Homo-oligomer: A and B are copies of this chain.
Amino acid sequence: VVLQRRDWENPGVTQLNRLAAHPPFASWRNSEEARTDRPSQQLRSLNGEWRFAWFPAPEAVPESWLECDLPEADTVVVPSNWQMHGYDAPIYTNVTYPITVNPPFVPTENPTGCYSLTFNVDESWLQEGQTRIIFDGVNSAFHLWCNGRWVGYGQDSRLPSEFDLSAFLRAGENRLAVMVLRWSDGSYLEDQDMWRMSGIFRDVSLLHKPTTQISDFHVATRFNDDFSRAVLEAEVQMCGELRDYLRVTVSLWQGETQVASGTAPFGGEIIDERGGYADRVTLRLNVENPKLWSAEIPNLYRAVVELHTADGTLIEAEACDVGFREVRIENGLLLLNGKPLLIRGVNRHEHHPLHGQVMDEQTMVQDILLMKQNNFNAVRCSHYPNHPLWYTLCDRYGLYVVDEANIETHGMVPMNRLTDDPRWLPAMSERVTRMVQRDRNHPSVIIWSLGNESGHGANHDALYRWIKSVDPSRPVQYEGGGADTTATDIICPMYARVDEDQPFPAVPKWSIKKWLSLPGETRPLILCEYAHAMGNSLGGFAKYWQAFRQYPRLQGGFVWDWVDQSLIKYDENGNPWSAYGGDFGDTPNDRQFCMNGLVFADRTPHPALTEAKHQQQFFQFRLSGQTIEVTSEYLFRHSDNELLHWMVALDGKPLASGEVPLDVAPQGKQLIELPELPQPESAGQLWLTVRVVQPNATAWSEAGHISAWQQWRLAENLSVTLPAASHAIPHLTTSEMDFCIELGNKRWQFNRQSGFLSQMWIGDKKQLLTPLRDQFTRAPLDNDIGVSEATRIDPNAWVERWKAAGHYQAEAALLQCTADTLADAVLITTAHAWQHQGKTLFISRKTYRIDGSGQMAITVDVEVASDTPHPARIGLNCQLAQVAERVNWLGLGPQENYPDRLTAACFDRWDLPLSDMYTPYVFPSENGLRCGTRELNYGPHQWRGDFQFNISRYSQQQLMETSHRHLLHAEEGTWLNIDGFHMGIGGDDSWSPSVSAEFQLSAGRYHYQLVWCQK
Contacts and interface: CB of A to CB of B under 8 A. Distances in A.
Contacts of A468: 461
Interface in A85-137: 89-97, 101, 103
A408 B274 contact: no
Nearest to A417: B277
A451 to B, nearest CB: 8
Contacts of A193: 410, 590, 593-594
A271 B470 contact: no
B463 A469 contact: no
A185 B427 contact: yes
- Chain B CB within 10 A, most for which of A408, A414, A418, A586: A414
A430 B156 contact: yes
Contacts of A977: none
A967 interface: no
Nearest to A280: B414
A536 interface: no
A275 interface: yes
A980 interface: no
Given A188-B418, A455-B274, A1 B12 contact: no
A80 interface: no
B589 A91 contact: yes
B14 A426 contact: yes
Interface in A685-705: none
Contacts of A412: 101, 188, 191, 274
Interface centre among A91, A441, A469, A580 (most CB of B within 10 A): A469
A565 interface: yes
A680 interface: no
Nearest to A10: B16
A159 B16 contact: no
Contacts of A416: 271-272
A462 interface: yes
Contact of A190 (B408, B459, B469): B408
A241 to B, nearest CB: 15
Contacts of A463: 462
A437 B466 contact: no
A409 interface: yes
Overall SS of chain A's interface: loop
A423 B271 contact: no
A666 interface: no
Interface string A158-172: 111000000000000
A725 interface: no
Given A21-B438, A156-B434, A428-B189, A413 B275 contact: yes
Given A101-B411, A458-B470, A91 B480 contact: no
B406 A11 contact: no
Nearest to A24: B438
Interface string A742-778: 0000000000000000000000000000000000000
B273 A415 contact: yes
Contact of A414 (B186, B194, B274, B431): B274
Nearest to A458: B469
B425 A437 contact: no
Contacts of A486: 469
A464 interface: yes
A23 B272 contact: no
Q: Which of A96, A426, A588 has the most CB of B within 10 A?
A: A426
B586 A411 contact: no
A481 interface: yes
A97 B411 contact: yes
24 contacts: A1-B4, A5-B5, A11-B426, A21-B433, A21-B434, A91-B586, A92-B565, A93-B581, A93-B586, A94-B590, A103-B418, A160-B438, A189-B427, A191-B409, A193-B593, A193-B594, A194-B565, A195-B565, A271-B414, A271-B506, A273-B453, A426-B426, A429-B462, A458-B466
Given A11-B426, A93-B589, 17 more contacts: A11-B427, A12-B14, A12-B423, A23-B441, A90-B584, A91-B589, A156-B430, A192-B452, A193-B594, A194-B565, A194-B594, A195-B567, A269-B506, A273-B415, A274-B411, A426-B426, A465-B465
3 nearest interchain CB pairs? Answer: A92-B581, A426-B426, A422-B433
